[PDB]
Amino acid sequence: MFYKEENFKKTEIGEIPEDWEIVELKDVCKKIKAGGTPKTSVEEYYKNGTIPFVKIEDITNSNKYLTNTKIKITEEGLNNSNAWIVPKNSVLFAMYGSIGETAINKIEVATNQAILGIIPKDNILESEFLYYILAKNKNYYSKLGMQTTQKNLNAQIVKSFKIPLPPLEEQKQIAKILTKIDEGIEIIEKSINKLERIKKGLMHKLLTKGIGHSRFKKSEIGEIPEDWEVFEIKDIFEVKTGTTPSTKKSEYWENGEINWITPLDLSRLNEKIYIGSSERKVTKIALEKCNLNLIPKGSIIISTRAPVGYVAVLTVESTFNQGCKGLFQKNNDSVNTEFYAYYLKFKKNLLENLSGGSTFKELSKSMLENFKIPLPPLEEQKQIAKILSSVDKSIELKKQKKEKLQRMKKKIMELLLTGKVRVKT
Template identity: 40%
Template structure:
């Protein structure tokens, strides 16, 4: 038989679900300890709010009881749910794994120990992330610089409560998606490590070289040259911004970018945030950089650079570098300019007070390694292939996160029921 829905203080839920307060289905902060007095010589893991990243406990300190900070007071057990009560909208919530059973967390957390006959810990955790729960936290928390909830506030938070078997099934489905996200995360970390290693290897040692030489930029293959960036470019072009007070300068068909739009090593149609008109171009310092050249941030977002795969106009934060393609492969240069060494160098050279900047002359004189063109192209191809793999993995993660969000909104409201 199909059941209907009922109105509740937290929205519509199925007729056979209840609305409960966290204080009804959990024990809040059930155990406390003063390690300095009660266990001065014992060693503990100490979980702080900063230890929580992406619903996982990471970067946990070990402390000796006598050295414990004054906030190290709450004892946690396996399967406790801990939620940050300081700025809870940042969502530092997690289930305590077996490794941290009997350890200590900060008083900046509320420890929720589930009454097992009433609520499933993972079901509770997923509910904490829902907008309706965060909205309740925002209404209840007090304080200015560090708004927080007290224990009474936490106990008042309301969530929907299906029968226990349904809770477990909902938690199982969402956990399956979380496991898939975790696997993709691991693949991303692995590919990022590979990319970093390849950049270090290929941009300093090249491919198949056995003889090397010491140069102003370090040890490089004997066949490579060291040149200035200006030696492989025809022109360096600054940009500008059409007046935002003149409507007819905007929403045209000319792509226009700022440094904020450089989020990858290339710029394509998907990178474009704004468009200007021909009039906007002609009545400002904005300039069009023809495709397959280099664009580098020299004022805001210093050090970011990309190859533009399309003709694009740039603003004053950017410099367009018109390359001599018979000497330089654009993607080889963009990989070199995005290496940690060069990014750090460019950032350290910035000058100015409010807005830092790099003079164009400095960019022209920047020393770079120059392999033979075929080797540049091969290095660029290898690094671009790895970067595309990384991009695909990140898109896969985004897709899984969208799926999870949709499932949470359906399953935790009862709009979609599960068979148990």
């Protein structure tokens, strides 16, 4: 069950419930000492080590539990330094570098003077509970300089940390809940990373070998399907240029309703393929007076200045500044813009070099025009683009599921670690 009512409560290190007892980390832990670094100049201290030596890095590169070590140390190195074999299921706390970064070592390890080996008193304080506690106040802990005297964290300072100490049974309960949440977030995060890997492989595969082919040939753009041809952007698209109507005239921006896309609007896309709105808009007067190029919906827009290589497909007609270039197809019956938007993202590094051919990176109109591209049959272009865009969508739905779970953890974590909700026992 879940204790709904909060009843009355104390108030020392914050609103704490009756049962809770604000205790000092040192009073509930049987050992809070820092590690040490054996004379790195001595080979006999590391030469074929058996004791995993933990550094600030090892903790940061660990997800809650520490099970791997980058470097090792032997008995001699150990005995000839301030490092000590920390018992399993303990809690490591980084005092320098990554202030607040905590973890639970699953294997006996040693640490340098940066990491702090902490051992909770048996049946007095759970390591699991301690982990989630030091995590909730991780940001608050790291903040120990902007206050007055900038100081990282001393072994004596951490020992004086005032943390809430609920019944041993509740500590296991609360920690079990947060542990389940964390595992969920881990499962989703693993599918996201794998799907992003598949997506990357699909980009290379599909855009070079297409789909459904068994015959290929050489070409100016490498091995490609036999049914595919090669051309230049100029051959299939018309390249349009943009401009920025004087900022001195309101007649150009006041209540603007025509999109005016800048490379900044594109960078904010976050890999999204479609763009249907711009931060700042221009008016019909600006369009005719400044003779801006208006490209229809379905056109391709790409940044040629500043962050070069950002590409999108317009969902609504729009104009754009000199920081971009537009691509309009000769006939919208032999080309799918989404496919080419993807092809261009795929060749971002290539476009980046063409422009970086000097100071002030700019992708000239000739550069874009002469850029070589594949020309698959319209139908295959739709197929390859449906696949790429459907996977991109899947990745996004997953990231959104992770986000809601991470927010939910942040919520529940706030309620359980305090006097709000509790477990039945």
